[PDB]
């Protein structure tokens, strides 16, 4: 493995040759965003145990949430009407997803299965093949879904045949999260090997690997233009990585916040990076300048999940306290 040193070094030196200035340098002159003060506009009541995941529909109105109460609930956020409640075979749920079409949702967890439900409500496919927990899943369309697993792999599935079309191998620790590129050609994963990986969906190869300072990555999200992404980790730090410059640009952290991060998302413009914390709050960061701009303090237990609507109008938080809140 002499050749594998020569290449590891080559990568380091190449990245350093690109590091001609820092993001903060570049953004030093722009105005701060000022104090971001969002208010709770909705409280979604009905889960009877910890919420582990949520995902907005593409209409910026319906959303699905998943709880250890053994239910998926689909809510109309505008009215708070419940539209569906789906009883799960396995209550040990870690993820859910809303298909872009609105026609299906998915979920799974310690059952190691990604279950698909047809909303137009019975289980329509159980995608079996992972050998560890299902941590995250996202539909590309009604026919394909990508998953991440505790087994250290991600996979692309053909929903009709129930087979893994592509298996994405390379992580050496449990994969906790994934995020699809806006155009679906690439996705990123974050794992307990403290790395984030960029994958080509159709070729099935890892294109680029990013390190997060030896802390587990629990959450990951693309920047809106698809040329960067952010991670949230156990070490209380969010990080921004650029794909074309192939390296970290910024960290977001305060010495007096020491708890884990569960969830990250950008606002529609990318200017704000929102993250959910074990200390029961969401912190809102200035993605360009790294200053903390604001806090969402509305939960009595961990914020386990969050999502920003496609129209940018709201953020949802989900919590171990059994509630979701909608903010803006």
């Amino acid at each position: 493995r002499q050749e594998a040193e020569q290449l590891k070094n080559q990568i380091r030196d190449a990245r350093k040759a690109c590091a001609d200035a820092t993001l903060s340098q570049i953004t030093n002159n722009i105005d701060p965003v000022g104090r971001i003060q969002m208010r709770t506009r909705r409280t979604l009541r009905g889960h009877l145990a910890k919420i582990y995941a949520m995902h907005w529909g593409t209409d910026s109105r319906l959303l699905v949430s998943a709880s250890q109460d053994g239910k998926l609930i689909i809510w109309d956020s505008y009215t708070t009407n419940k539209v569906h409640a789906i009883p799960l075979r396995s209550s040990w749920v870690m993820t859910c997803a809303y298909a872009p079409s609105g026609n299906y949702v998915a979920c799974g967890g310690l059952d190691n299965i990604c279950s698909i439900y047809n909303l137009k409500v019975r289980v329509s496919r159980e995608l079996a093949g992972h050998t560890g927990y299902l941590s995250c899943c996202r539909f590309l369309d009604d026919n394909q879904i990508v998953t991440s697993s505790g087994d250290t792999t991600c996979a692309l599935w053909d929903i009709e045949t129930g087979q893994q079309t592509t298996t994405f191998t390379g992580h050496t620790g449990d994969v906790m999260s994934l995020s699809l590129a806006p155009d679906t050609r690439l996705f990123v994963s974050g794992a307990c090997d403290a790395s984030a990986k960029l994958w080509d969906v159709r070729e099935g190869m890892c294109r680029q690997t990013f390190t997060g300072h030896e802390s587990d990555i629990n959450a990951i999200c693309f920047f809106p233009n698809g040329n960067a992404f952010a991670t949230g980790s156990d070490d209380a730090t969010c990080r921004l990585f650029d794909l074309r410059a192939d390296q970290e640009l910024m960290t977001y952290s305060h010495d007096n916040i020491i708890c884990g991060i569960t969830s990250v998302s950008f606002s529609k413009s990318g200017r704000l990076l929102l993250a959910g914390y074990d200390d029961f709050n969401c912190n809102v960061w200035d993605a360009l300048k790294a200053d903390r701009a604001g806090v969402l303090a509305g939960h009595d237990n961990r914020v386990s999940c969050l999502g920003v609507t496609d129209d940018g109008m709201a953020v949802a938080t989900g919590s171990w306290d059994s509630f979701l809140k909608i903010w803006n």
Partner: protein
């Protein structure tokens, strides 16, 4: 608007269903089984299905058939590996080839038990070298049901073989996801949970189990004479005990009732006649060849931990349905008294 009104009604119907499910959920008690591999967790679950559930029909039994074949292959593969590890010679020259055949079986793809494989298994099992290796099983990892299945290989290989209830109780059911087995008893739903198959990072899912009703920790009494060479010759019981201590000191299990099952009491009775406890735990001051003194000592050692928490302890033989009937009747009463 009519459509708006109908969506409101649909929401309220869902609220009704969620209320009803919530009422039912409050009649559920989660019993989390913990303990090292081979301690008896999966056997205990199967006994709950026999005692308080649907039991095992003939059709159910047929679903375990290939798993019994797989247990035979796994057991013989472990002995073949130990012949190498321990440098024990085979008596019979054909057994080089028989061992190679068995060594290369892909266990997960086994669906049949064809004659050449059965013959290889039997010829290996009767080899005096394999019998030496079996006699030295203290020194490696071999299923406590290996001898059972290998003794009964002819029955298992017979055309039309249908697993017995004992065969089902002893067989390894492979899974790397969560095991949940719920059963109804006196208007309560007991949800038995077993995470022993999972091979992922426990740190990322242990909080799924905050404030479970009860922890049921299993320790194999028969491991008292086994050590972990890689862990500075840590006694296997000491490792089980350290795991137990981590569990009973975990902040989110402080409200959980803790049940300790010191299992494999039958195997302790067998082993104590020839393997002396004082050789492994020199503080032991009881007589040799005395199972009662041994198990009492192991219990006291196990709960000697440094909380005013009560540990509800029982000796068990998890393969004995009558025994588990008796012990679980007392356990159920403990759990219900504490939770009602």
């Amino acid at each position: 608007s009519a459509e708006d009104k109908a969506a409101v009604e649909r929401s309220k119907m869902i609220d009704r269903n969620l209320r009803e499910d919530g009422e039912k959920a409050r009649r559920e008690l989660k019993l989390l089984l913990l303990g090292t591999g081979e301690s008896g967790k999966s056997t205990f679950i199967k006994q709950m299905r026999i005692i308080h559930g649907a039991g095992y029909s003939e059709e159910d039994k047929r679903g375990f058939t290939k798993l019994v074949y797989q247990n035979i292959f796994t057991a013989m593969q472990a002995m073949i590996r130990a012949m190498e590890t321990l440098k024990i010679l085979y008596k019979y020259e054909q057994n080089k080839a028989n061992a190679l055949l068995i060594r290369e079986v892909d266990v997960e793809k086994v669906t049949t038990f064809e004659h050449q494989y059965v013959s290889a298994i039997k010829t290996l099992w009767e080899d005096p070298g394999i019998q030496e290796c079996y006699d030295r099983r203290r020194e490696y990892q071999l299923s406590d049901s290996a001898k059972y299945y290998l003794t009964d290989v002819d029955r298992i290989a017979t055309l039309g073989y249908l697993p017995t209830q004992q065969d089902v109780l002893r067989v390894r059911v492979p899974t790397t996801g969560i095991i949940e087995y719920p059963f109804d008893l006196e208007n309560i739903i007991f949800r038995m949970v077993d995470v022993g198959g999972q091979r992922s990072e426990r740190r990322k899912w242990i909080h799924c189990f905050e404030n479970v009703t009860s922890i049921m920790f299993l320790v194999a009494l028969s491991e008292y004479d086994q050590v972990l060479v890689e862990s500075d010759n840590e006694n296997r019981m000491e490792e089980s005990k350290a795991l137990f201590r981590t569990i009973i000191t975990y902040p989110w299990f402080q409200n959980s009732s803790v049940i300790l099952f010191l299992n494999k009491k039958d195997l302790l009775e067998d082993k104590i006649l020839y393997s002396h406890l004082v050789d492994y735990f020199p503080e032991f001051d009881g007589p040799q060849r005395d199972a009662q003194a041994a198990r009492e000592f192991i219990l006291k050692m196990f709960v000697d931990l440094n909380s005013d928490k009560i540990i509800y302890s029982h000796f068990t033989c998890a393969t004995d349905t009558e025994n588990i009937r008796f012990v679980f009747a007392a356990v159920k009463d403990t759990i219900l008294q504490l939770n009602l």
